[PDB]
Structure formats: structure tokens, C-alpha cells
Amino acid sequence: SSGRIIQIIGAVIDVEFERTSVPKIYDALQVDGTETTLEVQQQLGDGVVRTIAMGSTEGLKRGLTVTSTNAPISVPVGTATLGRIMDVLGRPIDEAGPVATEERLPIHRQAPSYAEQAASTDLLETGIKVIDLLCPFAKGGKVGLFGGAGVGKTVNMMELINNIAKAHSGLSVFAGVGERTREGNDFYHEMKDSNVLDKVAMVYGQMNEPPGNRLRVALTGLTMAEYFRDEKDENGKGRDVLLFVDNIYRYTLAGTEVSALLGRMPSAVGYQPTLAEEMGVLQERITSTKSGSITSIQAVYVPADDLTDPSPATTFAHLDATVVLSRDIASSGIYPAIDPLDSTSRQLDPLVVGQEHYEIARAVQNVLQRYKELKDIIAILGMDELAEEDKLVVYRARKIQRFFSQPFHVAEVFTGAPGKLVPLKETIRGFKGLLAGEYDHIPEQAFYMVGGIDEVIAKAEKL
Amino acid sequence: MSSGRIIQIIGAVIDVEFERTSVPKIYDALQVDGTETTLEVQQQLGDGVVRTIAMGSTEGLKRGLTVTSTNAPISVPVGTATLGRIMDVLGRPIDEAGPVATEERLPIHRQAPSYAEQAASTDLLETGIKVIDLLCPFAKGGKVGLFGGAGVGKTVNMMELINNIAKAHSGLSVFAGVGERTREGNDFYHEMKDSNVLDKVAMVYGQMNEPPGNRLRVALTGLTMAEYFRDEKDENGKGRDVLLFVDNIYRYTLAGTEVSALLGRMPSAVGYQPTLAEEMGVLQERITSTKSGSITSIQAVYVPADDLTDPSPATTFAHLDATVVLSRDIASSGIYPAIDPLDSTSRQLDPLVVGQEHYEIARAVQNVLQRYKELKDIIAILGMDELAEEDKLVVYRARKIQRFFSQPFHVAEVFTGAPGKLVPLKETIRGFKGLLAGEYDHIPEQAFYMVGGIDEVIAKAEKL
Amino acid sequence: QSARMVAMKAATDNAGQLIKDLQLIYNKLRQAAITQEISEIVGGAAAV
Amino acid sequence: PSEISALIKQRIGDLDTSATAKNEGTIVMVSDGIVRIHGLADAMYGEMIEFDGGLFGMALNLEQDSVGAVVLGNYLSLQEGQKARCTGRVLEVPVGPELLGRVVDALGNPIDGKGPIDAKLTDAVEKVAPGVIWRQSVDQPVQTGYKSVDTMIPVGRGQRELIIGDRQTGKTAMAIDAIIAQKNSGIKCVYVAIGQKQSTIANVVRKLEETGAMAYTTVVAAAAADPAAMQYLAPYSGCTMGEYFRDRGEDALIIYDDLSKQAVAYRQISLLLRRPPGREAYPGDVFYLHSRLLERASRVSAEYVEKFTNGAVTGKTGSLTALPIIETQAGDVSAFVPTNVISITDGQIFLETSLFNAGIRPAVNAGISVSRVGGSAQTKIIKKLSGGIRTALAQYRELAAFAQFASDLDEATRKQLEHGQRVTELMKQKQYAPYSIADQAVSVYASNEGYMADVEVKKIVDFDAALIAYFRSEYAPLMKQIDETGDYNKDIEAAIKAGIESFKATQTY
Ligand SMILES: Nc1ncnc2c1ncn2[C@@H]1O[C@H](COP(=O)(O)OP(=O)(O)OP(=O)(O)O)[C@@H](O)[C@H]1O
Ligand SMILES: [Mg+2]
């Protein structure tokens, strides 16, 4: 009772079976010639099925026998994968020998039930000025990184990685999704020289494989994160784990590719109508739970800097912060180079962050946005013709921008790789003083490339 | 033997089979056996197969169920008793006050009026509202474009129109609610009732809670009602001349797009039905006057997206004859109605239509109102006394004009006391001409406000 | 002062004119975009 | 112990009482919760269908030879060959006041982990609006605790009013806060959530529980992890529960979430049925789809109430007010779906991104937001006192450009500008802080009395709060009486003004 190759067109495959013996959806189909594998997409009656090829699309012969597994796609999981890089099938692609474990789990579980949402919202700190002041995180949150091409975004993620690793036994995981493999290799080696791989797991989809593979890498990473969170350690509560999405947009595009060939009609942009279904399927399995939590970071690309179409629209209905990188702030020499005026979080709320921090954020928003709108007239005439009012405002804004300059903990070579991870409370103190004007008598340079008030004062005194 | 059985059902479209020796024609009426739903032949699919639409909900229905025909298009009750009655598209009472009294039934469809019956003359309807009566006179058997948002007294204006046409010209009134929202419909009913005018109008609503076919055919329903009343001859012949009120014809076009899409036919340039102009016309040509009787139309018009070049308003203007627009500011200035006497356009605005002197007078008024409008900004900014005293005279005279164009309404009598005043031309004309002569530049603006003819104005002025 | 006042008035008027221009072109472009997208959709649906 | 053993045995002996001669079908084709089945010649249109796995399905396309039906539960469990079976019934869900404090599925199945629900009554989800003859006008107001809202945009029991705006604009917050204000209204409320993150859903749940108002309240949510059909039908079910009480002569409020989203789901479903697409892939009936839903909510003629009750109740009249929400792309109104929506509601409210970005909380643009029901949806006193705000806000919004200006302009313009700036700021408000109509009344009185036309703008909110507390303490019986009735009387205004001038004389702000 083995099926055969009956029709192949590009990325869509069909097989005949004996009508009594019919494979169920989402179960693997074994090419009897090669290692290539097929996933069920829909059952075409008469023992006819439609499938997508996991692996190469070569060597294919009409009328070649193929067998099944009668079971969904399961790959090994567990601590025997940390610091190893796997394919979409969980095989060693790092030539580091085979995986050590046999703990294999399927990849199409259901979203966690309603009753098991973490009954309370949480918060996460990063020790980073602009973020922990203006982009708060909930443990279990959803984070978007928009734009940024004159700076090392991967450097930023790796900084967060060192943040969480030193901050918690909670490990980390990244998934290659349409990965610009140059940057992927760079990240791999730089994490390598960081000597931090024990808390990291690697799967790559690198713009070279049938769309299904790049679709499913996301599920793979999801599954790894799930299981790893579920390992309740010595207490009954496992570690809270972190995820890295190479790009959500490529996840959308993976399904977008062959949707029409699937017989699916186009959507409002020509897209796949199952867009929202798969999107929610993805997101709803990323939450905080009664025991443990899982959060993720999503490297976001924006087409032509346009957000007013479904592809980012659907995503936005699932994130919790919109970190939008800034290019000319990098041109201003700022290390993080993150815009301080557009990035937001839904987490900016006095009830969750306290009142003082919230109101400080309010005031800094106001001062920065007011300074921006005076740029033109300042250029036209000069500082003098402005009233004495807002001169201190200009100085304070400039000092704020300097204060945001945070030397990186892990670049290994940008300023010596010095970590700051300053407490939120100390930064609150410093920005409170600056808003009050406690130090509105010092050149902004003293606030540059440093952290708390102690560093600023020491720098100002040394010079 | 006309019983046919259901063969296929999707959404609202319905398919039946019949015997290849007895096949109903298109637009025939099918009553489902054992239920009160009705089917409408759209296109013969051969093999005794017909594709039709349903009229209402479609639930519980199952294939192979027998359905009969009528061998004829839809017919509804018509007659004198139809006034003060609200029926569906099928002409079936929904007021829940007994069945329809008449036994007279007429099919909904008929061909376009004959070229021979187009009356060889074109004259004007008399109204007593003193504004259209000068600036945008209505033809006899014309189409009046109406625009503006709600809350400006649209219902009120319709009230007064109905009152006048029924009173002087003994006109009969028919109103069709295309895509109606129930609440305002009920309010309009209660208004029909309190203001003692319900007894003279025939009412049918199609709600936006119904499949499109209902909404499409209420139009032809009311149309046929009007046709029956007009062709109903009076003593010595000469059946009445009647007015027709229809809401949001744009909704009509939208419902046409609906049914065309449901048929699985490709869209049009914007995406309307490609046949749009066909139904638009079919609506239009049955709106005219004849050698016997006449019909005139009032149609609520909404311009989606403010596109004067959109296909739907473009096709509308192909049949529009006069345009009337309603203002928000003017009403806020306590002037009622709030008709902008500067945007309203009439095809009938020609010395060959209203006569020579009337035409010139109207043109002069338009000039004065313009002139003052561009005066306004300077009056605001650079003061008032920095201008030509003739320009100031223009200002005062235009203010008098605006104060004067509003008037009490006989419908306003029950509203706020103050019984309205009916006024024809040849006094409005004379009074306005005298005002243009400046012979009344010795009187405050108040005598012109909430008042009838110039004789009344002078009476008040002397008494003021 | 007088000359500045008059120039501002003229500027307002030119602004109004340009507003009309842009609005008209916007209507045209919206129509064209709708046409293009609906044509795309109907062709794609006709593909099956 | 042995109790259940007897229970299970006695229940069992009640079954296999006969052999059924049912008519059913079998599976031919499956794709994405969509199944083509063969057989079942006789079938109700839109019949709910059962399947060998215990799941259920909704039949839509009755083609001449087969049936297409959509999975209601979770597919990926069905294979061709398995046999369907119709229920001889249409889709039906339970209702009942016991549903309060309960959270269920769009099918009406508990999700609160509170066990089964003892609903004595179930009803078909799909019905028709009552006869237009059974409509009587709207006069009873509905309170929002939002001075701008309750002043310029009155809301009457049984009216359809639309909140609309762009994204992350607190629209959800607007709905929920409006819900909160129903401590004293005596009405009940239903929240319909569509395609949402269970996290957000649970946060709303927890917050409501903190308010405790989840006792005259019921809520159902079609989250983003749910079958599209579930989402599509859910608002109709919510409408069904509302109509329950409405037909009981009761008055209530319901709220939708993202009717656009459920429209999207319906688009996808229809598309998978190989139906002819419309503009932007939207089947035309979307207009019909929404409209047949919205009109089901209104305020009914008490005569209809009486006749339906068959004498059970005679005094009151039922009502149901509809508060839907639409999210927009960059504040467009020309999009097909919103365009359809607009002509349906009895009034609309916009949210402007910049205002909230400017920190204007709430960020409503009154400049275009309207309510064509007039003052009939306000109380007599508010009906009296709205006009000052109306005209002041008008004048301001025409001539607000002079912010930096008026260093040489006429004084009257300056005074009117200050008036406008102050009153504009007056509406800035925080969530979860509803204003009683008495609070709104004292604020408006102080406004029109100009007793805030002498204080700096930066502390207007502080001024107001202080005044609020001052009256609340000193003159509690007065506001008591006010919100008991809501009538404007010279004695009342004299007492209010005396209190105001005392407050000014007394402790400062
Ligand atoms: N008056 C207010 N004062 C303080 N905070 C407020 C106020 N109004 C709203 N907020 C805050 O703004 C946040 C965002 O609003 P909300 O999430 O309701 O927008 P939304 O449009 O519902 O989002 P989405 O579009 O994702 O559904 C809320 O978390 C709420 O706490
Ligand atoms: Mg929301």
C-alpha cells in the first residue's frame, strides 16, 4: 500500500493511494527513492493527496513509489541540541555528528488553552536606557524591530542574549527564516567567540529551499521553545525562554508563495486567505503560562517603509512594542541608534510601571518632541532670537541624547565591549534629575557614551 | 402543470427545473409551495433549468421541493385605498391593519413610454416655497437633484412639497424607501400621521435587513403605483400629475451591483454592474409627463467619496434636470429651509423657459448674492466702512434678500404655530424686482424674516 | 504692512487652487487603483 | 461513590430505545475546515451537522449533487469515507440570565472553567428584525461617563452608534469603560471579542472582575486561534442573547469587536466555497451580512413586548443599544467595508491618532463625530447645558490657528480663545474614571459660568478634580437628588453656584 508520483508542478505534489489506506493531514511521506519527505496539505479523494516537498525538488520521477509514517512531523528536542545547528528536519547541519537524544515531539500541537494564560501580566528589564524607559517588556511579550541597515542589529540581539543568559538560566533560541546567511554566519561566529552557545539552539531557513521548509522552521523553533520551557526544574516551574525570529515577513511570504498553486484564490493584495489563520496559530502558541512563560524577538522588515497593507498590519495586532531603529541617530555617533520618539509599547502604563517612571517618560517625550519642532526656526535665526525659555530645553534634550549612548556589552570590539545593564531605578534617578535640571550646567559630552549619573559626573570632573 | 422542484441552492440565488415543454419566461413569479417565499426568473439555463433569486430569507429549504409559477411578472394591489398604507415590495401590508382593500392588480414591468406620448410642451410646476420658484423652477415631468446631510429638515421639505402638490394641483404622493433604516422610517410614519398628510400618500419601504432583490424592486413597485395613479384618468380625462419621492438612488445602484455580482458577472470600470446604465434608464424613462397626466420625481442623492466623476453620479446627472442643495450653515443661521441659493442649478434656467424678464431678474439676484459673498471676507478683515457706499448698499440689499427667502410653512403650523403662507409667482417676482430697484432701502431686515409676500413685508414694516 | 497683507491673501488663494488640483488628481488615481486591483482579482479568480 | 454507579446505569437503560432510520452523508473532499460531502438529499438550508468524531458543521452550499459545509470544531481529524449526519435542526445556542458572570464559546460553551451552564432556554441564532410597526421612538439616554461623548454625542437606549478610528486608539478601552458606567443603569451588557490574543482577553476579564461588574454581564470571545466559522457566527449569537432580554421587555447594551475582522473571516470562507468574488474579494452580501445583524438591535414598541409576553409583562418596553467598532487603515473612510458600515449606524464617532499622540486622552475628534438622534438621548439638564460647549468648541476649532498669535489682535478674540483652550482641555480624561452626570453637570456649570475663565490652563484638571471632591463631600445630597432625576431648576443651579463660589472662597487648588 504505497503511493506513487502522479503529478508534479513546481512546488505542489500529488500521490495516489489505495482508497482504504489514506494518509491524514500533516503526516510525513517517505520518498522511496530519496530522503526527501512530503507533508499532506489536503486530501483529494480516490486515494489522491496533495503535498509539499520537504527537501530537494530533484530526482523526481512520475510513478515513483512513496510511503508514509501515518504520524505528524516529529523532531528530537532536549538539552542535546544546545549549541547545535539543525535543518528543518532536525538533522546536524554543523557536521558536529548526530544529535544525542531521541526525545522527539510533533510540531502541530494546539494553541494553549484559555484557562492556562498566566493569570498576571509581568515585566522584563534589559538594563538599556531607551528601551527600559520607553520600550518596557512583559515576560512573554512580543517585540518588533523595524528597519536598520547602517548598524549591527544582530549585535543588538546578541546583547539581549547576554542580558538574558547572565540574567537567567532561561536559555535562548534563534530560527533562520529567510536568513541573509552572511549575517547568520557572522552571528554564529560572534556568539561562538562570546563562548555562549549552551543556552542557544539554531535552525536555519536560508532562502534556498522549497517554501514549506522556510515556513516550518518557525514551527520548529516554536516547538523547541515550548518543550524547553516545559522542563519543570526542581521547583515545578521551568525557566522562561526567549525566541528570535529571523523575519516574520518571510514567514508570511513562505505561505504566500505557493498558495495559488494550492488552488487557493488570491486575497485583497493577492495574498493567501489563510493568512490570519496561520498568523494566529503562530502567535497564540507564544504566551505566558501559569507555569513558565515564553517570549520572543521578531526582526521585522517593512516593504518600502509602508505599513498600510495587511502584511505588517496582521503582525502589529500581535506585538507589544514597536522598536523602530534610527539611521541618522547612528550618524550622530550613537551606539544603540534607536529612535526615541516613534518606538512605543503597549506596556507604558502607570498601573504596571508605577507612576513616577510613567510620568518621567511622559516629560521626556514632551521635551524631545518640542525640541524637534524648533529645529527649523533655530536653523533660520539662531538660539538667541528664541526666548530664554527652551534654551535649557535644547540643552536638556542634547544631554538626553548623549545619556542614551550606551556602550555595548558584547560587540568584542566596539568600545572594549563594556556592559552597563544599569538598574531601571538608577536611570530613573538620573533622568529625573536631568528633567529637573540638577545637572543642566554641564556640557552634553559628559553625558555621552556613559550610563548613570556617577559616570557622567566622573567624566565631567576628569575633563 | 407548472409545479417545478428545487434543484440547487447557494446563498440567495436559487435554481429549479421544469418540463421542456412548459418553461416560464424571464421575470416570471414563482411561489414556493407550502411557504410564502417567492422566486424571480433571471436567465433561462436551458434543459428546463432556470436560475432565479429569492425574495427574503432562504432557510430550511431543501432541494426537490415543488414550486409553482404565475406565468406573469409580479403584480401588486393598486387603487385609491393604497394611501396611508405601508406595504412591502410585494404590495403586502405591513402596517398590520387588515389586507389591501382593492382587487386591482397590475404587473410591475412594462415597456418604456412611447415616443408619441412625450408631451410636445414643457412647462413649470407651481410651488409656494418662493426659492425654487425663482432660482430653480421645476419642469413638468422633471428630475430634481437633491443633496445635503440629514438633520436639515429633508423630511420637512418633503412634507411641505406634498402638502402643496396635493392642495393646489391635487397631486398624489408616493414614497419609496430604498435601503431604509427602520427607525427613521417609523419616525417618518409618525410624522405622516401627526401632520395630517398620511391619508394622501402611498408608502413602501425596503430595509437594509433584506436580500438585495427586495431593495431593487421596491423602486419599480412605487413607480408602477405612480403610473397607475397618473393613468387613472380624472373627469374629462386628464389624470392627476403626481410627485414621487425616492431615497438614496445610489443605494439602488449599489443593490444592482449586488445582484449582478451574485449572478457571477464581471464588474465594471469602478466595479458596478456593467449593465448599470440599463437599469438606470429603465428607471428613468418611465419618469415623465404625457398627453394625459404627468409624473415628477424627487430623489435623495448621496455622493460617496465626493467624486463628481464617479460613474454612478455621472449616470445620475445624465437624467438630472434641476439640482437643489441643502446647507448646514444657513440652517444654523436660523434660516429655513437651508437651500443654498447659489449652487442650485436648473436646466429650466433660460429666458426661453421662465420668460425674458424673469430670467434677467434671477440672473441679477445671482449676481448680487455672489457680489456680496466675495464682499464678506473684506467686511470681516478690513472693516466695513472702507468700501464704496454702493457696495454697502449691495450688502444691505443682499442681507434683505437672504432674510426674505425663508418663509413660514403650512406644515410648520402644527410644529410651532405660525401658520404658513402660500405664495405664487408674479408677486415674488414683483417684490424682488422692486427690492432690486432699491425702493425698499428704508426698512430694517426684520420685515423680510418669516413672512409671505411683499405686501405682507410692507404690512409688517409699517407695523414695525 | 499693506504689501505683506496683500501677498498673504494671494498666497491663500493659490493654496486653494492647488488644493482643487490635487483633489481632482487624487480622485482619478483612486479610480485607477480600484480598476487595477479588481482586474487583478477577477483574472486570478478566472484562473480557476 | 456508588451514587454515580446507580446514576450511570439508570441513565443507560434509557437508550437504544429504537433503531433510527436517519438520512446522512459521507465525506468526499477536505481542505482547511471545508468539506465536500456526498448524500443527504433532504437537508435544511444552513443545517448544523454532526460527524462521527463528535464535531459539528455548518452547511452552506446546497449544490444539485453534493453538499459543502464548514467545520465548526477543529478539523485535521476527518478523512474521506467517514459519515456525516444532519441533526434535523438549525443552529441554536442557549440564553438565560444565568449566563451572567459566565464566559462561553461562540457556540455558547463555558470556557471559564465553571462547569456546565443551566440554561433553561436555547434559540436559533439566525432570525429577523421585528416589524417596523413595532418600533417606538428613542428617549431614554445611555451614559458613558465622558463629558464630550455625553454632551455632543448623545446615546439613547436602542440606538446604533459607531466608534471608529485607527489602531491602538483605546477603542477597546472606550467600549469597556462605557460598560463600567452601568453600575446603576440596571441594564445588562454583552461583550463580543473577535480574533484577539487570549492574553488581552484575560486582561479585560481580570480588570472587569476587579470592577466586579461581571455580575450583570456576559461575554463571548472568538479569539484568533479559533475556526473562522466560529468567529463569523459569533456576533449573531451575541445578538441572540441580547434579543432574549430585549424581548423580555428589558433594556441592555452589547458591543462588537472588529466587525472588519469577522468580515475578513467571512471573505475567506466564501472564497473557499468557490463563490464569485467581488471588489477586494468581498462577496457582495457583506452589506447584507452586517445590515441583517445591526438592525436586530433597537428599542421596541411596548405593544410588541406585551403581545410577545402574551400578558406576562405589560409596562416596560424592550430595547437594545448597539455599539460596534471598526478599525481603519490610516484613517480612511472610503474603504469598501467602512463605507458600507457608515450608512447603517444612527451616528458615528471618530478617533484621531494625533490627539492621543498629542496626549489628548481621550483622542476623539468631535469635529466630524455626530449623533443624529439629537438631545432626546440626554437628560433635561444636560440637554440644557450642552449648547455652550457646542458653540465654544465650534468657534475654537474654526479659529484655533491663532495659538501663537493674538499678540496684536482684538481682545474679544483673545478671551474667546482662552475660553476655547480651557474647555478643550476640560475633556482630557483617564480610563476607569467615569464621571457621574452630576460631575459632568458641575463641570459644565463652572465652564459656562466662566468661573474657570480666570485660572491658568495647566491646572484646569486639578481645579476640576478639587471641585469634584469638594461637592462630593460637602453637598452629597444635592448630587444624590440630581442623578436621581437629572433636572435643571433655578433652586438647583443656585445651590450649585453657591457651592462653586464657596469652593473658590474656600480651599484653593
Ligand atoms: N484616558 C486614558 N488615560 C490613560 N491611559 C489610557 C487612556 N485611554 C487609553 N489608555 C491606554 O491606552 C492603551 C491602548 O489602548 P487600546 O489597547 O484600547 O487600543 P486598541 O485600539 O483597542 O488596540 P488594538 O487596535 O490593538 O485593539 C490601553 O492599554 C490603555 O491603558
Ligand atoms: Mg481592540
Side-chain angles (χ1 to χ4, degrees), chain A residues 171-451:
Chain A
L171 320 170
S172 75
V173 74
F174 166 78
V177 177
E179 191 152 19
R180 299 184 153 175
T181 305
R182 167 191 63 86
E183 293 179 353
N185 185 13
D186 289 11
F187 151 79
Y188 158 83
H189 271 336
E190 293 179 353
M191 281 325 307
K192 177 177 177 61
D193 313 328
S194 84
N195 321 322
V196 188
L197 283 72
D198 50 307
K199 315 194 190 179
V200 191
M202 284 73 74
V203 191
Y204 292 165
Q206 45 189 359
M207 321 185 258
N208 51 349
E209 299 171 356
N213 311 295
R214 311 166 293 194
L215 166 62
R216 299 292 183 184
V217 291
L219 294 83
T220 66
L222 182 63
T223 315
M224 311 285 208
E226 291 178 355
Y227 181 76
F228 277 138
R229 184 211 38 200
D230 314 335
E231 317 163 306
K232 308 296 104 180
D233 62 357
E234 80 183 3
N235 160 266
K237 202 174 179 300
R239 62 199 179 281
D240 300 279
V241 176
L242 178 53
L243 182 63
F244 293 97
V245 176
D246 190 77
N247 178 19
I248 176 58
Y249 195 18
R250 303 287 62 67
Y251 159 81
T252 72
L253 193 55
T256 313
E257 289 177 75
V258 309
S259 311
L261 277 296
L262 294 174
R264 304 173 167 176
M265 295 299 102
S267 310
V269 177
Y271 288 169
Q272 38 182 351
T274 182
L275 161 74
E277 286 285 79
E278 301 168 353
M279 186 66 203
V281 159
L282 186 57
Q283 316 309 139
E284 300 273 41
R285 298 173 72 155
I286 297 169
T287 50
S288 305
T289 68
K290 305 287 199 290
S291 197
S293 178
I294 288 167
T295 185
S296 177
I297 305 301
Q298 293 177 335
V300 191
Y301 158 77
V302 64
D305 291 354
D306 183 303
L307 61 83
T308 312
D309 62 357
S311 58
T314 68
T315 70
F316 182 76
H318 295 105
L319 65 89
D320 313 313
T322 65
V323 176
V324 285
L325 298 190
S326 53
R327 153 160 196 74
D328 299 334
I329 297 169
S331 78
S332 77
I334 288 303
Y335 306 149
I338 314 163
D339 173 271
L341 55 85
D342 181 301
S343 296
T344 184
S345 304
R346 295 176 64 186
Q347 293 305 326
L348 285 74
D349 176 79
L351 266 66
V352 295
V353 299
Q355 196 90 345
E356 50 172 341
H357 155 78
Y358 169 85
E359 65 183 1
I360 301 299
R362 303 309 315 166
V364 299
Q365 298 160 55
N366 308 138
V367 56
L368 296 188
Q369 64 190 130
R370 160 71 178 170
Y371 159 70
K372 161 206 66 55
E373 55 199 359
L374 291 188
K375 176 85 143 51
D376 45 1
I377 187 49
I378 293 158
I380 290 185
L381 308 179
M383 272 193 35
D384 54 339
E385 306 308 282
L386 171 60
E388 174 276 309
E389 178 50 49
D390 304 329
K391 303 205 176 194
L392 295 174
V393 175
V394 170
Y395 316 149
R396 287 168 283 191
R398 299 294 296 163
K399 294 146 186 52
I400 284 168
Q401 295 175 311
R402 306 312 172 163
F403 200 109
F404 284 153
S405 295
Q406 188 151 36
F408 294 167
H409 187 75
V410 292
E412 297 198 33
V413 185
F414 204 91
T415 74
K420 324 271 296 170
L421 307 192
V422 298
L424 177 59
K425 312 317 294 156
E426 160 65 25
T427 300
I428 286 292
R429 179 66 179 86
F431 282 157
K432 166 159 38 200
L434 182 59
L435 290 175
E438 286 187 30
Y439 322 107
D440 198 4
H441 43 89
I442 319 187
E444 44 170 316
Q445 322 308 137
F447 312 78
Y448 194 39
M449 294 182 286
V450 288

Side-chain angles (χ1 to χ4, degrees), chain B residues 61-84:
Chain B
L61 295 174
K62 53 176 58 183
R63 300 169 275 148
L65 189 42
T66 62
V67 161
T68 177
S69 70
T70 74
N71 309 111
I74 313 181
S75 190
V76 295
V78 299
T80 177
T82 61
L83 305 175

Side-chain angles (χ1 to χ4, degrees), chain D residues 53-67:
Chain D
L55 277 185
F56 285 90
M58 186 66 203
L60 277 296
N61 305 139
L62 267 295
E63 69 275 16
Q64 63 84 30
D65 57 340
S66 162
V67 176

Side-chain angles (χ1 to χ4, degrees), chain B residues 443 447-448 451 453-464:
Chain B
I443 301 166
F448 311 87
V451 71
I454 185 51
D455 62 358
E456 306 196 1
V457 180
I458 309 151
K460 179 174 166 197
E462 185 277 332
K463 284 188 178 296
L464 293 201

Side-chain angles (χ1 to χ4, degrees), chain D residues 171-172 191 196 257-258:
Chain D
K171 292 189 292 185
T172 300
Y191 183 55
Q196 296 308 309
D257 193 8
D258 291 331

Side-chain angles (χ1 to χ4, degrees), chain A residues 42 117 119 263 273 346 358, chain D residues 31 168 198 206 268 274 361:
Chain A
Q42 65 183 357
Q117 311 305 102
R346 295 176 64 186
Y358 169 85
Chain D
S31 200
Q168 274 194 154
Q198 284 180 344
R206 289 145 49 174
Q268 180 184 337
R274 297 318 198 196
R361 293 182 183 174

